[PDB]
Enzyme design. Structure first.
Site, PDB file in Angstrom:
ATOM      1  N   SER A   1     112.051 -24.860 -11.307  1.00 59.23           N
ATOM      2  CA  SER A   1     112.276 -24.307 -12.535  1.00 59.23           C
ATOM      3  C   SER A   1     110.949 -23.775 -13.468  1.00 59.23           C
ATOM      4  CB  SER A   1     113.041 -25.335 -13.384  1.00 59.23           C
ATOM      5  OG  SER A   1     112.479 -26.538 -13.351  1.00 59.23           O
TER       6      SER A   1
ATOM      7  N   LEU B   1     105.577 -21.122 -12.479  1.00 55.90           N
ATOM      8  CA  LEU B   1     105.038 -20.411 -11.274  1.00 55.90           C
ATOM      9  C   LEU B   1     105.689 -20.283 -10.050  1.00 55.90           C
ATOM     10  CD1 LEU B   1     101.171 -21.899  -9.849  1.00 55.90           C
ATOM     11  CD2 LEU B   1     102.993 -20.385  -8.535  1.00 55.90           C
ATOM     12  N   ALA B   2     106.622 -21.135 -10.039  1.00 56.80           N
ATOM     13  CA  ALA B   2     107.315 -21.200  -8.720  1.00 56.80           C
ATOM     14  C   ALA B   2     108.542 -20.173  -8.938  1.00 56.80           C
ATOM     15  CB  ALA B   2     108.189 -22.642  -8.623  1.00 56.80           C
TER      16      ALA B   2
ATOM     17  N   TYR C   1      91.793 -16.198  -5.559  1.00 53.84           N
ATOM     18  CA  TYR C   1      90.974 -15.059  -4.997  1.00 53.84           C
ATOM     19  C   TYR C   1      90.637 -15.105  -3.514  1.00 53.84           C
ATOM     20  CZ  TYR C   1      90.698 -13.351  -9.704  1.00 53.84           C
ATOM     21  OH  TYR C   1      91.061 -13.017 -11.029  1.00 53.84           O
TER      22      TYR C   1
ATOM     23  N   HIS D   1      86.808 -18.691 -10.017  1.00 53.67           N
ATOM     24  CA  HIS D   1      86.851 -17.646  -9.398  1.00 53.67           C
ATOM     25  C   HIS D   1      85.606 -16.881  -8.838  1.00 53.67           C
ATOM     26  CE1 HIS D   1      90.993 -18.306  -9.474  1.00 53.67           C
ATOM     27  NE2 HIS D   1      91.083 -17.769 -10.913  1.00 53.67           N
TER      28      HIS D   1
ATOM     29  N   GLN E   1      90.086  -5.131  -7.431  1.00 57.18           N
ATOM     30  CA  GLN E   1      90.928  -4.659  -8.158  1.00 57.18           C
ATOM     31  C   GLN E   1      90.436  -3.589  -9.381  1.00 57.18           C
ATOM     32  OE1 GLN E   1      92.745  -7.648 -10.167  1.00 57.18           O
ATOM     33  NE2 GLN E   1      91.368  -7.734 -11.695  1.00 57.18           N
TER      34      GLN E   1
ATOM     35  N   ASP F   1      81.319   6.079   0.887  1.00 58.88           N
ATOM     36  CA  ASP F   1      82.330   5.478   0.772  1.00 58.88           C
ATOM     37  C   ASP F   1      82.725   4.933   1.971  1.00 58.88           C
ATOM     38  OD1 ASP F   1      82.028   6.245  -1.702  1.00 58.88           O
ATOM     39  OD2 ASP F   1      84.026   7.140  -2.123  1.00 58.88           O
ATOM     40  N   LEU F   2      83.662   3.600   2.049  1.00 56.80           N
ATOM     41  CA  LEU F   2      84.500   3.148   3.040  1.00 56.80           C
ATOM     42  C   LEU F   2      85.681   4.137   3.079  1.00 56.80           C
ATOM     43  CD1 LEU F   2      84.886  -0.237   4.778  1.00 56.80           C
ATOM     44  CD2 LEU F   2      87.042   1.035   3.836  1.00 56.80           C
TER      45      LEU F   2
HETATM   46  N1  NDP Z   1     102.643 -19.298 -14.258  1.00 56.17           N
HETATM   47  C1  NDP Z   1     101.501 -18.322 -14.660  1.00 56.17           C
HETATM   48  O1  NDP Z   1     101.645 -17.397 -14.887  1.00 56.17           O
HETATM   49  C2  NDP Z   1      99.962 -18.488 -14.197  1.00 56.17           C
HETATM   50  C3  NDP Z   1      99.481 -20.118 -13.434  1.00 56.17           C
HETATM   51  N2  NDP Z   1      98.274 -20.518 -13.517  1.00 56.17           N
HETATM   52  C4  NDP Z   1      97.992 -22.055 -13.451  1.00 56.17           C
HETATM   53  O2  NDP Z   1      99.013 -22.658 -12.469  1.00 56.17           O
HETATM   54  C5  NDP Z   1      99.683 -23.548 -12.623  1.00 56.17           C
HETATM   55  C6  NDP Z   1     101.047 -23.748 -12.721  1.00 56.17           C
HETATM   56  O3  NDP Z   1     101.690 -24.295 -13.353  1.00 56.17           O
HETATM   57  P1  NDP Z   1     103.149 -24.036 -14.306  1.00 56.17           P
HETATM   58  O4  NDP Z   1     104.175 -24.515 -13.272  1.00 56.17           O
HETATM   59  O5  NDP Z   1     103.129 -22.544 -14.217  1.00 56.17           O
HETATM   60  O6  NDP Z   1     103.281 -24.548 -15.577  1.00 56.17           O
HETATM   61  P2  NDP Z   1     104.672 -24.940 -16.247  1.00 56.17           P
HETATM   62  O7  NDP Z   1     104.472 -25.773 -17.489  1.00 56.17           O
HETATM   63  O8  NDP Z   1     105.495 -23.977 -16.537  1.00 56.17           O
HETATM   64  O9  NDP Z   1     105.459 -26.103 -15.398  1.00 56.17           O
HETATM   65  C7  NDP Z   1     105.975 -27.344 -15.632  1.00 56.17           C
HETATM   66  C8  NDP Z   1     107.116 -27.937 -14.881  1.00 56.17           C
HETATM   67  O10 NDP Z   1     106.703 -29.258 -14.472  1.00 56.17           O
HETATM   68  C9  NDP Z   1     108.193 -29.931 -15.348  1.00 56.17           C
HETATM   69  N3  NDP Z   1     107.563 -31.129 -16.252  1.00 56.17           N
HETATM   70  C10 NDP Z   1     106.288 -31.655 -16.390  1.00 56.17           C
HETATM   71  N4  NDP Z   1     106.381 -32.629 -17.428  1.00 56.17           N
HETATM   72  C11 NDP Z   1     107.641 -32.884 -17.304  1.00 56.17           C
HETATM   73  C12 NDP Z   1     108.132 -33.793 -18.195  1.00 56.17           C
HETATM   74  N5  NDP Z   1     107.930 -34.707 -18.947  1.00 56.17           N
HETATM   75  N6  NDP Z   1     109.604 -33.871 -18.264  1.00 56.17           N
HETATM   76  C13 NDP Z   1     110.325 -32.713 -17.577  1.00 56.17           C
HETATM   77  N7  NDP Z   1     109.765 -31.717 -16.893  1.00 56.17           N
HETATM   78  C14 NDP Z   1     108.543 -31.833 -16.683  1.00 56.17           C
HETATM   79  C15 NDP Z   1     108.758 -28.895 -16.042  1.00 56.17           C
HETATM   80  O11 NDP Z   1     110.437 -29.436 -16.014  1.00 56.17           O
HETATM   81  P3  NDP Z   1     111.170 -29.703 -14.732  1.00 56.17           P
HETATM   82  O12 NDP Z   1     110.403 -31.109 -14.220  1.00 56.17           O
HETATM   83  O13 NDP Z   1     112.649 -30.236 -15.084  1.00 56.17           O
HETATM   84  O14 NDP Z   1     111.325 -28.590 -13.672  1.00 56.17           O
HETATM   85  C16 NDP Z   1     108.542 -27.759 -15.327  1.00 56.17           C
HETATM   86  O15 NDP Z   1     109.422 -27.293 -13.963  1.00 56.17           O
HETATM   87  C17 NDP Z   1      99.045 -23.924 -14.120  1.00 56.17           C
HETATM   88  O16 NDP Z   1      98.328 -24.948 -14.591  1.00 56.17           O
HETATM   89  C18 NDP Z   1      98.345 -22.490 -14.430  1.00 56.17           C
HETATM   90  O17 NDP Z   1      96.934 -22.576 -15.484  1.00 56.17           O
HETATM   91  C19 NDP Z   1      97.143 -19.490 -13.346  1.00 56.17           C
HETATM   92  C20 NDP Z   1      97.520 -18.038 -13.383  1.00 56.17           C
HETATM   93  C21 NDP Z   1      98.949 -17.443 -14.050  1.00 56.17           C
HETATM   94  O1  BG6 Z   2      93.939 -11.889 -10.803  1.00 61.22           O
HETATM   95  P1  BG6 Z   2      95.149 -11.156 -10.592  1.00 61.22           P
HETATM   96  O2  BG6 Z   2      95.263 -10.239 -12.207  1.00 61.22           O
HETATM   97  O3  BG6 Z   2      96.467 -11.748 -10.652  1.00 61.22           O
HETATM   98  O4  BG6 Z   2      95.110 -10.029  -9.563  1.00 61.22           O
HETATM   99  C1  BG6 Z   2      95.557 -10.482  -8.235  1.00 61.22           C
HETATM  100  C2  BG6 Z   2      96.093  -9.370  -7.363  1.00 61.22           C
HETATM  101  O5  BG6 Z   2      95.241  -8.241  -7.572  1.00 61.22           O
HETATM  102  C3  BG6 Z   2      95.857  -7.321  -6.622  1.00 61.22           C
HETATM  103  O6  BG6 Z   2      94.893  -5.974  -6.792  1.00 61.22           O
HETATM  104  C4  BG6 Z   2      95.754  -7.422  -5.257  1.00 61.22           C
HETATM  105  O7  BG6 Z   2      96.190  -6.497  -4.551  1.00 61.22           O
HETATM  106  C5  BG6 Z   2      96.324  -8.697  -5.013  1.00 61.22           C
HETATM  107  O8  BG6 Z   2      95.995  -9.087  -3.823  1.00 61.22           O
HETATM  108  C6  BG6 Z   2      95.712  -9.684  -5.930  1.00 61.22           C
HETATM  109  O9  BG6 Z   2      96.577 -11.253  -5.762  1.00 61.22           O
END
Ligand code: NDP
Ligand code: BG6
Ligand code: NDP
Lengths: 535, 534
Positions: A69, A72-73, A240, A301, A429, A458-459
């Site tokens: 949920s 990220l997932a 990266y 990175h 990018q 250029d490649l």
């Molecule tokens: N998402 C993005 O766009 C980006 C992600 N990242 C990095 O990757 C990492 C991915 O983390 P992310 O999943 O996105 O962050 P989230 O905060 O969105 O995920 C939190 C998850 O853990 C559960 N959780 C944690 N503590 C509790 C609690 N006390 N009670 C209930 N649930 C809890 C939450 O509910 P539940 O357990 O019910 O599922 C939820 O599913 C981040 O640290 C981020 O810095 C970097 C670039 C972009």
């Molecule tokens: O760091 P960002 O903004 O998420 O960019 C990542 C993406 O940039 C794109 O240009 C590449 O095709 C992907 O391989 C890459 O994951």
């Protein structure tokens, strides 16, 4: 009855509906009409054959994604997993389970709308998504409950024993799409209840980018994970390291004698690695206020890019001797000092479109965290002595851009001012590219062979999946060539920690710059004093 | 009949795809198509581009082309001068006059049908063709008559006296489009009667190859011209030195540290300079039989390319500094031996389309003349010790192209069999191109990391080179003309092998037309450091 036909009709309406949410405002009245009209000729059809090795089909595999949920997932992990199924890299009998504490009313509605909604565009490929969703299951439970992991293991053990292959047991891969604070409790619950069947099978755990915020906070976090899993099982992905153009860095350097002869201080005058981004914080200033641009994209990175660029030749292509050189080169860098750093904080832009970083309500008042940071590293070894290494990163800048820009010394003799510095650029990018800039004589008859101009070799784009899933394939193979190692993590934090303590202590302050510009103009003055020549 | 024109344009696109960049053919056809539109813009013949320096117009200029009725002045020299006039490089009051022994009737009719007929095929676009002819004139007389030169001087003195500029006298450029044996008499007639007017001007004399056929016969010819003119006044043209891709060889090397750091034996594994031609002798076998391919295009053309590739960096871009390095590098080369040579002679093609070299009526039976020659040279200095230098030239072979092909030493350890030698190719014909081949990771599979594919880094950016050499002589830029010391040292490298082939110590290997050559030649290339493969 009306058998089988129901599956085809439902396979349309879910496909548009994911696009309807991504199309978002305004009225959807026309969006349904022409997208299905485009699909009429888009309507492949052969089932993709497994390119997976025959050895991987020998015994069952299970993929558990915690935090299903979580943000990220939803947007990354699962959509990347669907991309691998289209390529055939997954075994035909693969089982995926989504683990999250959140209650789910009905899994079948959930996978059709909460997970497929972020899938890669499916106008040409949407029919295959329905077959993919049968592999996905869901499991509600706590991350610290040893009981629920004993309940989850009973579910995995059934499909592990139901596998149709000569080998029995099952390999397991966990993806911690979780905040770092949750990582320790999950690995404890895995070790006490989710370990692979005694008859056979390995276990591997993927963990996400945030590893603390300084050298000490990251070290104790890896110390917490030591009892439950060893380095071979932990896969600390970097965003990266799976990228196509940067995986080429090890090949462009050492596989070619022409580049290797000049990859030294005698020829290289300056190196810079920029991470420019035109977006602001997008209203999430508090999520970034605790981070800052230095630990967001520079300690992790750009440092991984600098390690691949400055590493000595690996003894072989084995993953660890590659990573061994990645650590040995980072140990030559003395920690960054405040004299070698320039910070910035974007303000309200002249366009009026982007609110300033302090204009966002979530940002605490008086914040000094940097939205921009250019800095010089100093490698102390025979290969790189005296060579500037300029790392640069920033949000709300003039253009979206990340690239390497090596600049070789020009030999003024004979040509003098007729010639200039050679430079090798490696861009990832917006679009992948590589090219070398040189001076050559102009085709026109001119005279004295002095009418020259800059020219690039250029490649020519000699020839899909995003790095998030390319690394997932590496963990499935056990390669681990492109995953950060803990010793690689501790040294990368050591380079930045003394500087990070100074910015946290207020010894230096960000330089304001309104959004959409190159950044603070003092940063360009700093780059000019650190070996960057330009036309 | 209205539809016929469309079919031809697409066929020329086919040749470029197989020639180079044979990857992602879709996008390649697009960019090559738009370039064809600029190959001829059909630009209107309105204004003339007067880019010539105004100081070049300060004094009267005259160009004397001996042998104006001869085959070379007919098809190349005069048409080149018309292109320089279309380029505006000639002074507005330029005078050019032709010299030939034959008497001509109605001279205005003669140039309109014998010389303008061989003008560049831009004549449909060249509106001012007849305006260029007004500068042309004809002169009948002997090449050894000091009296005819004294009356030719009176004709040039009149046109020099008609000049309308503050500077006095006249500049004179003599083009000897004549067989070399005549050169000793023409320069003697120029000295006793045709030297530039005392009030001012300069004299320059262009002479064509052959420059002898051996080291001593060449030295006799240069000494025969020695009393009348110095090296600053003599301009021995080589057809290749004016071409853009070979003039760029000096710039590609020393203007860029990248190539400068690797231009040494530590990195270069092999060098090849190839000259291929699909054309056979095609019924003109007698003139080639006493020459041979070794002195036809190897001792002159390919040797000049080899000097520019291996020369040490000039102290400056002055023309004498470049030729000085060209002679010192050639002095390190020991003369080619018969073991380092494999000759060939083409026969009738299997299809029978091109008659064999001995099927031509003009060739004597049993000739040992070589139409094919591969050789290894050995430079002996700190930069080029131990590196093979493979020259190759041959007529009636599979393909028409001329190119340099450097092969850098392979880096074995980092990738093993996954990688191979790097290459730097510089082709001049059929089309100019330069690119460096390198190994890169093949996008796709995340694992393995040994999966790689070769790729090229192609370079990305009309006065033909014959016109550029004439313009270089008019401007005094002698950088692209072989010097006397540069020429005789090149003869010494080849003569002991040339004396052997004339003595029959080695004889050409037969090979059918349209093939790469003798099969023994290819293994000799493989045996001397060449090793490129898929
Ligand atoms: N998402 C993005 O766009 C980006 C992600 N990242 C990095 O990757 C990492 C991915 O983390 P992310 O999943 O996105 O962050 P989230 O905060 O969105 O995920 C939190 C998850 O853990 C559960 N959780 C944690 N503590 C509790 C609690 N006390 N009670 C209930 N649930 C809890 C939450 O509910 P539940 O357990 O019910 O599922 C939820 O599913 C981040 O640290 C981020 O810095 C970097 C670039 C972009
Ligand atoms: O760091 P960002 O903004 O998420 O960019 C990542 C993406 O940039 C794109 O240009 C590449 O095709 C992907 O391989 C890459 O994951
Ligand atoms: C290149 O260019 C140079 C000359 O080319 P090309 O025109 O074919 O040479 P040619 O042998 O064809 O001579 C061309 C001109 O020179 C005169 N000529 C013809 N035969 C002879 C001869 N035996 N001796 C002296 N003069 C002669 C004629 O001038 P005229 O009409 O006055 O008799 C003729 O028009 C060569 O070195 C070649 O390798």
């Amino acid at each position: 009855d009306q058998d089988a036909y129901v599956a085809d009709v439902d396979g349309i309406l879910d496909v548009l509906r994911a696009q309807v949410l991504e199309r978002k405002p305004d009225d959807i009245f026309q969006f349904i009409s022409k997208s299905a009209l485009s699909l009429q000729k888009d309507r492949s059809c052969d089932r993709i054959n497994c390119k997976v090795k025959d050895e991987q089909k020998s015994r069952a595999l299970t993929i558990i994604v915690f935090g299903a949920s979580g943000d990220l997932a939803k947007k990354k992990t699962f959509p990347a997993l669907f991309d691998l199924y289209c390529g055939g890299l997954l075994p035909p009998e693969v089982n995926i389970i989504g683990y999250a504490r959140t209650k789910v009313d009905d899994v079948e509605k959930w996978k059709h709308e909460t997970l497929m909604k972020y899938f890669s565009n499916l106008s040409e490929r949407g029919c295959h998504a329905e077959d993919f969703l049968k592999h996905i299951s869901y499991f509600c439970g706590a991350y610290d409950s040893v009981d629920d992991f004993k309940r989850l293991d009973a579910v995995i053990r059934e499909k592990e024993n139901a596998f149709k292959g000569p080998e029995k047991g099952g390999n397991r891969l966990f993806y911690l799409a979780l905040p770092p604070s949750v990582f320790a409790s999950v690995c404890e619950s895995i070790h006490k209840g989710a370990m692979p069947q005694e008859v056979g099978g390995w276990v591997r755990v993927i963990i996400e980018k945030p590893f603390g915020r300084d050298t000490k906070s990251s070290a104790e976090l890896s110390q917490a994970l030591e009892p439950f899993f060893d380095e071979s099982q932990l896969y600390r992905i970097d965003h990266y390291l799976g990228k196509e153009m940067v995986q080429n860095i090890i090949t462009t350097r050492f596989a070619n004698r022409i580049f290797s002869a000049v990859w030294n201080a005698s020829n290289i005058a300056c190196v810079q690695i920029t991470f420019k981004e035109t977006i602001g914080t997008e209203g999430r200033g508090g999520y970034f206020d605790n981070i800052g641009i230095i630990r967001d994209v520079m300690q992790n990175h750009l440092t991984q890019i600098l390690a691949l660029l400055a590493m000595e030749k690996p003894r072989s292509l084995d993953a660890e001797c590659i990573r061994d050189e990645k650590v040995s080169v980072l140990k030559c860098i003395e920690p960054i000092t405040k004299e070698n750093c320039v910070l910035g904080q974007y303000t309200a832009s002249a366009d009026g479109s982007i609110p300033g970083y302090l204009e966002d309500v979530t940002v605490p008042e008086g914040s000094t965290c940097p939205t921009f940071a250019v800095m010089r590293l100093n490698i102390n070894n025979d290969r790189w002595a005296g060579v500037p290494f300029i790392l640069k990163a920033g949000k709300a800048v003039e253009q979206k851009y990340v690239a390497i820009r090596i600049q070789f010394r020009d030999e003024v003799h004979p040509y003098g001012e007729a010639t200039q510095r050679n430079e090798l650029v490696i861009r990832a990018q917006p679009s992948e590219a590589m090219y070398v800039k040189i001076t050559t004589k102009v085709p026109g008859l001119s005279g004295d062979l002095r009418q020259t101009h800059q020219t690039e070799l250029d490649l020519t784009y000699h020839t899909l999946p995003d790095a998030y899933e390319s690394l997932i394939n590496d963990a499935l193979l056990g390669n681990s060539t492109n995953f950060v190692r803990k010793d690689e993590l501790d040294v990368a934090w050591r380079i930045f920690t003394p500087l990070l303590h100074q910015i946290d202590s207020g010894e230096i302050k960000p330089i304001p710059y309104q959004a959409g510009t190159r950044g603070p103009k003092e940063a360009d003055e700093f780059i000019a004093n650190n070996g960057f020549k330009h036309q």
